[PDB]
Amino acid sequence: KFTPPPSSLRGPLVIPDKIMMGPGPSNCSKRVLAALNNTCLSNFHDELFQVIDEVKDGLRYIFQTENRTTMCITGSAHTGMEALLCNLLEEGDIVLIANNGIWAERAINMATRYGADVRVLEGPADKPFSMTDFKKAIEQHRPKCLFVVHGDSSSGLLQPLEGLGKICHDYDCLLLVDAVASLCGVPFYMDKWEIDGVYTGSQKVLGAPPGITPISISPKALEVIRSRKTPSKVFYWDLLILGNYWGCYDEQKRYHHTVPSNLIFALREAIAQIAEEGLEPVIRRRQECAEQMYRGLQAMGLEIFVKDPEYRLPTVTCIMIPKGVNWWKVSEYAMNNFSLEIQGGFGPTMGIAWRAGIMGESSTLQRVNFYLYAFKESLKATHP
């Protein structure tokens, strides 16, 4: 005797192809999606350990670090933010957060939740912080950790990082960076920029399925986690024990949790494509695409949230909605008529812009010209 099954599961799974040029999930390649179609291996199968070691080598490549303490967390990229703050901060520890968009606000939320003394450097969403802004705020607050968003997908803002680590280190402070939307889209040098903790997202520039999160921490950062008098609040992403299974220490592997092998298979292959082509050509192609996007947008009389090109994040461009234009009518027509994802605004850009992403397989000149055409045609047909 059971309550009978619902009728909503009687039909098939039907997902159409979409051209995914939000900042959202990106298009993954054929090679990457085929990698999902494999045995969900055991935690302790040799073939899985092999894939994990290759993935760690690949992450040290795309992060540009020698950090042994390089792994994935099982979850979305939020998970990276959670783990850096959860692990590195005890009750009362002072964290400084540079806030000019919604991802800082998330970080402010979590750090309060883990019981930290949160200090906030506030700024306008459309301009970056100067080294002078950071120095004063570190002097004032004398924080254990600084948290900074590198590429803000909610603004289209790229925060320059050259020298912030030296400054952080002069004041005995760890430097933590979100590189979810920035990595493989612009130059990034974890070690030379003296970053003590970074994470990215599988579904942004890498063009891999969501659900698995690259993370890396510095020897200094490992040392602070080892020093803690109190245990971190979450077993699931305690980096001393997750690190163990990921074979980051001089220890026998122990079962911690069941890793999403299929997702990890897809991530290996995604890194492989970037290694094959080379990190520098991949970044340049994304840079060239963004130039083309700016040229086309200029030709159409449309503006960009971040006015100063120097400080624009190439992978996410926030296109301003002109007076008299309904944004959702454009987005809805594009999807319905071209299968194009033209995503609305978010955080500081809510209500005032669309977000145009150049990530994964949509990082080509041909995809950029189809975006502006479809966008243009979607305006005209919804506003005459």
Ligand X SMILES: *Cc1c(COP(=O)(O)O)cnc(C)c1O
Known binding positions for pyridoxal 5'-phosphate: 76-78, 153, 203, 255, 258
Q: By CB under 6 A, is residue 78 in contact with ligand X?
A: yes
- The answer to whether 41 contacts ligand X (rule: CB under 6 A) is no
CB of 154 to ligand X, least distance (A): 8
Site string for a copy of itself, 204-223 (x = CB under 8 A): -----xxxx-----------
Q: Taking CB under 8 A as the rule, does residue 229 contact a copy of itself?
A: no
Nearest distance, CB of residue 290 and a copy of itself, angstroms: 17
Residue 181: contacted member of ligand X, a copy of itself, none (CB under 5 to 8 Å, by partner type)? ligand X
Does residue 275 interact with a copy of itself by CB under 8 A? yes
Using the structure block, give the residue that is written with the tokens 């602070």: 224
**Binding-site residues for substrate, please?**
153, 355
Spell out where the chain has E strands: 70-74, 94-99, 117-122, 145-149, 151-152, 157-158, 174-178, 197-199, 212-217, 316-320, 343-344, 353-357
Which does residue 229 touch among ligand X, a copy of itself, none (CB within 5 to 8 A, set by kind)? none
Q: Checking phi first, is residue 346 left (phi over 0); if not, alpha (psi -120 to 50) or beta?
A: beta
Question: Please, are residues 124 and 99 in contact by the beta-carbon 8 Å criterion?
Answer: no
345 touches a copy of itself by CB under 8 A: no
List 95, 271, 316, 374, residue binding a copy of itself (CB under 8 A): 271
145-149 and 151-152 strand pairing: unpaired
Instruction: Return binding residues.
Output: 76-78, 153, 203, 255, 258, 355
Of 29, 94, 106, 329, which one interacts with a copy of itself (CB under 8 A)? 106
The verdict on 28 binding ligand X (CB under 6 A) reads no
CB distance 339 to 16 below 8 Å: yes
76 near ligand X, judged by CB under 6 A: yes
* 158 C-beta neighbours (distance < 10 Å), count: 23
Q: Are 200 and 359 in contact (CB under 8 A)?
A: no
Radius of gyration of the chain (CA): 22
129-188 binders of a copy of itself (CB under 8 A): 187
